[PDB]
Symmetry: D2
């Protein structure tokens, strides 16, 4: 199986690295405006492969995405000193109007996997531009945060993260929604499991966990200037779900008909991921306070969209 | 890490095979009354190891269980033509009174993992005989059936089995309880997920799934005379949980203070499994009809116990 | 990819179990003259898959073989205490005369992988009956003995087994030839390297190792009645080689035009194994004594074949 | 087991990422002069672990190294466009003069694994400063070039890379020596085997391959400014070797008493790597020309060391 990556920067190369080390696909093609950057990365990683799995990593052009089952969109421009967040965005939407036609013309059956920040806005742009069914354009969204959430709860509960079912929904960023109300652990409600364990879960415990999840990205960016190891591996996992037609449940961003009262917007909700992308959406139970944050989250996004032409 | 297996028959050797192929432990010691059977098995499997993982598989005696972190009890005698189920049992309880002291004298810190059928009665015998804390003696119980249950639901729902949380509780056998009432899929109740999918789940669907789970063991036994591949791999998974202090949730059999109104009995309930065995029990929600079957199940067992001296 | 297995006893079933546990193929079809046996093994194995890899194991007829990339031929008769080498051969030959045509009708394009003892002569009849090109029919042959030979030499020298290059060639059995003369370790002559590590191989060392290798199968059979755990994993490796078009080097059995003067006979030589079966032979340096041993080995196999009419 | 990493830039961080993704160790501690960088990389990586293996990645000080079985030394200075080979060396030497003492105070019993360029001279200073026995300080050296050499030869011959035995020796850099003369494939002389497959290595073939190997790092650096993806996985393999006491053969750098007449210098030779670090050397056959190339290589490294006072 072949997999493509457009934008061979930290995020794109880190995704290629994770795919290689995990032996997810047998072939990975990197594409970038800076051809020598993409070649340098391909060969750097190729140097790794004999110490992991046989994976053919190379750099090429769009035409070389031919036969790819999924193409990661990790392309984007560098933030200018004194530039708004609103113009950085516009520029990237411009990059994407260039990239999407060129991807789908070479690889008309590929699922599109959006990585470039802000993931939800960029996921919408990509959906509009593709003209494909809504399930074919998937954004990484809040997967990392959902896993962080579960990890912290598992830590607190002295249990395996695998038995913790909790979600982070909505906008990947500071307004994302941690779904405390309906999270389960070992098939039973969070709080009941917590107390049959000697660990109520004080409002102060919840604040610590919410910070742990909510501000991770920010702390990472503050310390090294950008995130990529995490998403690299998250994306690899999503590619795996696609290639193996896994139909596993993931909090990923996609174009939604409606959510919490808002129409036609891309945000994270637990979705069934497989061969053709996302075929089906789970709708977890929300507290009034939780769904109010979700719609407010949905509000912000869907207006950012229109106000960019998408 | 070292792991021991007492009873090097189909079940014990198949467990050793699964441990080897999966590279769960670095060393596996087999023990059997028939020394040459155990040696033959160890070396047969050792022939396999270069095609999987470096695992030192050998045959020895009880003293050779020294340093084992877990010891599988897969020992048992062959059914006699014209013998009751009640006397086959008695004989095995006799085998176990021999085996348990000898295991724990060589390996005083090992977790005991019971395999020999009937698992719940044999798990009780082993608990009584050990004199160890209740969490140190774990039976495979209904793990296979819990996984079968989840697999069939996942099949029906066109979803990944990993997102299906459902339990089979109680007595490993024809009176086991499939917990339909409170099963979840992707963190939401089974039936709500089923309908937001176009698949109500008719009483006829439930009957098909219940047969699929309930009678698998019987069909297998009917066709080749005994089950071992399944439990082999199930046991390997339990050994893994122990060795990695995973604290993962498994429907395994253990001595319980109380369950559905019955006191001091070994049966399957979802339990946290780790370094010292099982440290904690989940209590899933049950329908009135479900808990009535659980107690009736508990009834049968706990009397089989006393009536055997354990 | 689909793998077929014809002959679902201990050899065929362990193979399928090993395929499942290692996640070599997505689908494994079991075929046996005893239909309920195959079905029982299939369900027993399917019970294990949740504890390893998503693998679809099921039992069916010869037609259910359609599209299989490789077919393991493990069908044969129950041994009879007292019967000769040649008597058993006559019976299994009789079996392949039924099985082979049926496989090729259903999956003409499958690589045939022969496992049934004596594997060298059985490979010879599978090949003659198949009318396939010579590389598309391959017996497991001597692979387990080659691997044990490397392991014992690695133990003696205190190095990883992967560092050791040595072969056992010819008949899978008493006459097989350990190639001491040109054995390498980390790319250098074994004797030289052994002496450099300050440990020249005494005749007694050589003697103990030969025994360890050549008489392994004998001990397993005396102790438990048959071998299967070993070959199951070796066979799974061979299947993997074929599915992934590895072009790996394996001492497997195949029809060979001439060897040490003996003409048109099937035995193990190091061969390159990939998607079409074998496609290339490696000729290690044989001392004069080893060539004579090989010649003698080939002559034994050639006479056995001739008496059956092959 | 705990692995330490000192120097948490692109080389140190990819290493940790590769350790995490491959599940080599349970704990990886990151140490950097820039504390928020290390913390950021640690959290970025921790974000990936749910999509791979339970690995605890965190950032701390030198004391947090206590109990580490191996420590990766990847600390160094930012390159300066225009600076010489010797200038950069002087700066990194200065760095190890601070780092080394601090590591040995905290984890005296850790195998030191050197990564910082130029790795051969840096290994030399780590060794002299450490006062450790010679095998307990090991540089990554030439491993990536050895592996690329095998891959290109395997591609040319159309065989699996595992079948190919060949080494690159000496300086990790321009003077490194590809050992054509005694290269083996499947245990036989490469030239002979190449000709047997009907494909003798033309001078142009040899020429293209040398280039492919020797100038890989150069291209990666021109295209993206530094190498790290490759060495990260190579280093993770070396750590694995040490943690598991593999006694595997690797072309890694270490202090060597004499080589081709050059005395007391660190360079890559094939070495046996296990729990104490390296403990044995393998001496491949060098043609007269290769010996001269090696001699020349060793002399270059020895002069560089001497000018720093080592
Ligand atoms: N139109 C485009 N097509 C492909 N790659 C692009 C395009 N525009 C920018 N890039 C690359 O996207 C990458 C973003 O890097 P990073 O933000 O570090 O992941 C950079 O390597 C850019 O060269
Ligand atoms: N006291 C005992 N200690 C160890 N192994 C035993 C004992 N009694 C019976 N066994 C073995 O337990 C195995 C049960 O085989 P199976 O029922 O096929 O798993 C047989 O191989 C017996 O030899
Ligand atoms: N003509 C045949 N077609 C298919 N399977 C067969 C045939 N003859 C024997 N077998 C099976 O081959 C298997 C041999 O088992 P084992 O020798 O234990 O690997 C048994 O399960 C037999 O039923
Ligand atoms: N004395 C030191 N102790 C610890 N880390 C250091 C020291 N000097 C430099 N480093 C780090 O070494 C790393 C080199 O990064 P790179 O060359 O990209 O692998 C940088 O993160 C530096 O901060």
């Amino acid at each position: 199986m072949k997999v493509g990556i457009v934008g061979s920067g930290m995020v794109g190369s880190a995704t290629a690295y994770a795919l290689a080390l995990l032996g997810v696909a047998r072939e990975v093609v990197l594409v970038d405006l800076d051809r020598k950057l993409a070649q340098a990365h391909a060969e750097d990683i190729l140097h790794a492969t004999p110490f992991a799995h046989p994976v053919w990593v190379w750099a090429g052009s769009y035409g070389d995405l031919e036969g790819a089952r999924a193409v990661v969109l990790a392309a984007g421009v560098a933030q200018r000193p004194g530039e708004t967040r609103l113009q950085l965005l516009d520029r990237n939407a411009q990059v994407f109007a260039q990239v999407v036609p060129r991807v789908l013309e070479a690889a008309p059956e590929a699922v599109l996997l959006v990585a470039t920040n802000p993931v939800d806005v960029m996921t919408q742009v990509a959906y509009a531009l593709s003209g494909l069914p809504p399930g074919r354009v998937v954004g990484s969204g809040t997967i990392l945060d959902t896993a962080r959430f579960r990890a912290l709860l598992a830590e607190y509960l002295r249990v395996a993260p695998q038995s913790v079912h909790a979600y982070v929904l909505g906008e990947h960023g500071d307004s994302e929604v941690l779904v405390w109300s309906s999270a389960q652990v070992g098939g039973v409600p969070l709080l009941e499991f917590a107390e049959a364990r000697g660990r109520a879960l004080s409002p102060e415990d919840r604040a610590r966990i919410d910070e742990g999840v909510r501000r991770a990205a920010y702390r990472i960016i503050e310390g090294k200037g950008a995130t990529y190891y995490g998403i690299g591996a998250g994306l690899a996992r999503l590619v795996r779900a696609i290639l193996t037609d896994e139909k596993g449940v993931y909090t990923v961003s996609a174009f939604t008909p409606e959510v919490a009262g808002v129409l036609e917007v891309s945000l994270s909700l637990p979705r069934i991921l497989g061969a053709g992308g996302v075929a089906g959406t789970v709708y977890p139970s929300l507290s009034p306070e939780e769904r109010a944050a979700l719609r407010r989250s949905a509000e912000i996004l869907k207006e950012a969209a229109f106000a960019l032409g998408f």
